[PDB]
Paper text:
Nucleotide-binding domain, leucine-rich repeat receptors (NLRs) mediate innate immunity by forming inflammasomes. Activation of the NLR protein NLRP1 requires autocleavage within its function-to-find domain (FIIND). Here we present structural and biochemical evidence that full-length rat NLRP1 (rNLRP1) and rat DPP9 (rDPP9) form a 2:1 complex that contains an autoinhibited rNLRP1 molecule and an active UPA–CARD fragment of rNLRP1.
This is further confirmed by SDS–PAGE analysis of the crystals. The structure of rNLRP1 FIIND resembles that of the autoinhibited netrin receptor UNC5b. Inter-domain interaction between ZU5 and UPA largely involves the first β-strand (β13) of UPA, which forms two anti-β sheets with ZU5; this explains how the ZU5 domain can block the release of the active UPA–CARD fragment. Collectively, these data suggest that H942 of rNLRP1 is a catalytic residue.
Author numbering:
A (entry chain A): 48 to 187
B (entry chain B): 188 to 329
C (entry chain D): 188 to 333
D (entry chain C): 45 to 187
The structure:
């Protein structure tokens, strides 16, 4: 419910709706197939049909600890709880704040973490861009 | 379920890598005097959101100004300074990632009356070069 | 009611003041080879307690060694080093206060064979003087419950 | 079998007094000091001076949910652990709260230490009766 949190889409802007202000739970009704970009969060979605996506803000501290497995991985972007119907989402672009303009960061060292019920899954991105990583056919 | 981007560390490099940072400026006008809170944080919408909410509880509201244009290194340190005579506490900020659930480091800048406007600066502590500034003027308050 | 010690900061100095730090060493042996976790934190029983609780989830065991002799400054940085054959991730530790609820940073040291022992060192990154040293030897590796 | 006292016990005039664990998940403990005297716990850094037998309840706390309630809290940095201590009104003559600031340099002004005490109406900052190298002294505390 604000011009700052709009998604840019093929038929113009689509407004994010607040579902729970105190828990940072939001919702967007993408009106048709195509590519949508939210500059406020850095999220992009490529969808195949109209679909409702809801998006919660999370903290890694609940999920990522200093364990023998997780210790060698650094937080590189925000953590989102995303829910959308299967088969509707071609790709999600998850933002990251690592600078790649200098040839200092190997792109094969990026992963998408996915914290399911039985523990952390580590997903090699389809590709890594300057400010986001792409996950194809996500099962949220 | 929850998802986001991780970067594998290299022994040579560790946590202190180059990142896109954002400056966040908040003000409170109380009586005739203005106080600024200046944050320097990774470009992370969940961090910016938690700071917005914490600052709003104390009636501080964000003023938009462009962020530093160069990538900055995690752990690098910056000196906060100003054109006008002002009280700054602390004078030094460190760029680091802190979870949106923890408090964030900021510099408090008590200005007094704003007058014509005030120029806030961030300078690399190491070699003293200017990395960022903003001109804050009465019209920016709105 | 809840009570503890606070220190009023001065504008010139900020948070970056001298504190009594403690090194905390944890280990896990897996055959010949061993992992050490080295922490450098303020001397605070609640931080020490939080670290000890997290380490014991993964069967890491604390090794008691004397702490650094000199007061160290918050925000200052320290290079972890040892002999040529030990992998260290990360090499730099920064001394800072993080709440006992936050994850605490440590350096992970992996050595394929302990041999006679591993000499672990902390060096001030600004002027390269050694500030802390420990010799971790097989005799120091004691069973899990102390 | 066991040693007679450990680092986690309070050491007083009658030797070590054992600390009971009330809940080890929430880090709550209690101790019954048997008689008047000064007692100290190496593991925590706490000291108590009491004038009679008294039970003291001690919980480990985090500063987080207390230290972001007024803007004037921003100019104070954590200098030691936060403890939730409860004891019968009269018995405790003095409590020593550990801190991790180094005074050996002389680069820290003794007068800048305060004992924060979080009552239901907000924070009180009390001037310590004494600041020693590794603790601050609060006389006649009202927990």
């Amino acid at each position: 419910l604000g011009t700052d949190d709009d998604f840019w889409g093929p038929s113009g802007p689509v407004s994010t709706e607040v579902v729970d202000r105190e828990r940072n739970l939001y919702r967007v009704r993408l009106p048709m197939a195509g590519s949508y970009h939210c500059p406020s969060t850095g999220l992009h979605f490529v969808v195949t049909r109209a679909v409702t996506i809801e998006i919660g803000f999370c903290a890694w501290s609940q999920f990522l600890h200093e364990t023998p497995l997780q210790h060698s991985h650094m937080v590189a972007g925000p953590l989102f709880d995303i829910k959308a119907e299967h088969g509707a989402v071609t790709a999600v672009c998850l933002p990251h704040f690592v600078s790649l303009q200098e040839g200092k960061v190997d792109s094969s060292l990026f992963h998408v973490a996915h914290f399911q019920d039985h523990g952390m899954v580590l997903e090699t991105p389809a590709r890594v861009e300057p400010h986001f990583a792409v996950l194809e056919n996500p099962s949220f | 379920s929850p998802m986001g981007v991780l970067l594998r560390m290299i022994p040579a490099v560790g946590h202190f890598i180059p990142i896109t940072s954002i400056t966040l400026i908040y003000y409170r006008l109380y009586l005739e005097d203005i106080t600024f809170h200046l944050y320097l944080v990774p470009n992370d919408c969940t961090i910016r959101k938690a700071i917005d909410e914490e600052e709003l509880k104390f009636q501080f509201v964000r003023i938009n100004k462009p962020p530093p244009v160069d990538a900055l290194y995690v752990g690098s340190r910056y000196i906060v300074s100003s054109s006008k005579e002002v009280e700054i506490l602390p004078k030094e900020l460190e760029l680091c990632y802190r979870s949106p659930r923890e408090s964030q480091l900021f510099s408090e800048i008590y200005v007094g009356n704003i007058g014509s406007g005030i120029n806030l600066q961030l300078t690399d502590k190491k070699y003293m070069n200017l990395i960022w500034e903003a001109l804050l003027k009465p019209g920016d308050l709105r």
